[PDB]
């Protein structure tokens, strides 16, 4: 089945967990404590010396986006054709780019950079509002009329930014409605409300 090996935080596993939950998939959580990680052996066995580590049978994967694409590919959440698949990648790449800036702020310089980051936020979110407006008026998903792995990753990105900058989605009606709509999906709603998700910190350094 599936096993996700990660630190006791949402971080880069939040999106893939939402995907698994919403798709009614069963998985195992292997929690890595800071003490275990600092021991060194685990880190050394990780391909790029990082987590998450993912196991699907005897297939061992590293890199959050590789895991998302793998699940999207095997679970049929990667567009209806090659054209949609490319657009899904384009959205995910954009989500990844903003995620990198977010992580840099959180772990590198939260105190000094928070204000500039928040001022620049609207410009960073606009592309996703635009994509939504060009797809069935933003009434369905980020790409096409079926959910994709990019939806889960984008949803997570939006959720964590609302925590960082409450109200950042007020200027974007499509993204706002999108978050509410996806968050309302039965299995996803149940997961997002569960202790498994709720009692885990977004990040590892206590900042959000």
Ligand X SMILES: C=C(CC)C(=O)c1ccc(OCC(=O)O)c(Cl)c1Cl
Footprint of its own copies on 91-110 (CB under 8 A): 93-94, 97, 100
Structure tokens at 50: 């990082």
**Considering CB distances under 5 to 8 angstroms, the limit depending on partner class, which of ligand X, its own copies, none binds residue 116?**
none
Cβ-Cβ contacts under 8 Å for 122 (sequence gap 6 or more): 168, 171
> CB count, 10 Å around CB of 137?
9
User: Is cis: bond before 52, omega within 30 of 0?
Assistant: yes
**Of 103, 120, 171, 198, which one interacts with ligand X (CB under 6 A)?**
103
The annotation status of 6 as a binding-site residue, yes or no, is: yes
Q: Is 2 annotated as a binding residue?
A: no
Is 37 among the residues that bind ligand X (CB under 6 A)?
Answer: yes
Q: Of 28, 40, 73, 139, which one interacts with its own copies (CB under 8 A)?
A: 73
Q: Considering only CA atoms, which of 163, 153, 154 is closest in space to residue 16? A: 153
| Number of shown-chain residues binding ligand X (CB under 6 A) | 10
Does the bond joining 190 to the residue before it have cis omega, within 30 degrees of 0? no
Q: Which span (8-16, 69-77, 120-128, 161-169) binds ligand X, by CB under 6 A?
A: 8-16
Instruction: Confirm or reject binding of residue 112 to its own copies (CB under 8 A).
Output: no
Among 42, 61, 165, 179, binds its own copies (CB under 8 A): 61
Member of 82, 108, 115, 166 binding its own copies (CB under 8 A): 82
Contact 95, 86 (CB under 8 A): no
Q: Which of residues 129-168 bind its own copies (CB under 8 A)?
A: 130-131
Task: State the residue for tokens 């893939």.
Answer: 16
């Amino acid at each position: 089945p599936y096993t996700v090996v990660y630190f006791p935080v949402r971080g880069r596993c939040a999106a893939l967990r939402m995907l698994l939950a919403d798709q009614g998939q069963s998985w195992k959580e292997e929690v890595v404590t800071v003490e275990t990680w600092q021991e060194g052996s685990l880190k050394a066995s990780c391909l790029y010396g990082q987590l998450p580590k993912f196991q699907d049978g005897d297939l061992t994967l590293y890199q959050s986006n590789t895991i998302l694409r793998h699940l999207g590919r095997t679970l049929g959440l990667y567009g209806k054709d090659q054209q949609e698949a490319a657009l899904v990648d384009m959205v995910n790449d954009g989500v990844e780019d903003l995620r990198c800036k977010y992580i840099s702020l959180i772990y590198t310089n939260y105190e000094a950079g928070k204000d500039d980051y928040v001022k620049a936020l609207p410009g960073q979110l606009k592309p996703f509002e635009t994509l939504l407006s060009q797809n069935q008026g933003g009434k369905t998903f980020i790409v096409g009329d079926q959910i994709s792995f990019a939806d889960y990753n984008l949803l997570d990105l939006l959720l964590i930014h609302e925590v960082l900058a409450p109200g950042c989605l007020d200027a974007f009606p499509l993204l706002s409605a999108y978050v509410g709509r996806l968050s309302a999906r039965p299995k996803l709603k149940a997961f997002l409300a569960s202790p498994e998700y709720v009692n885990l910190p977004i990040n590892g350094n206590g900042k959000q």
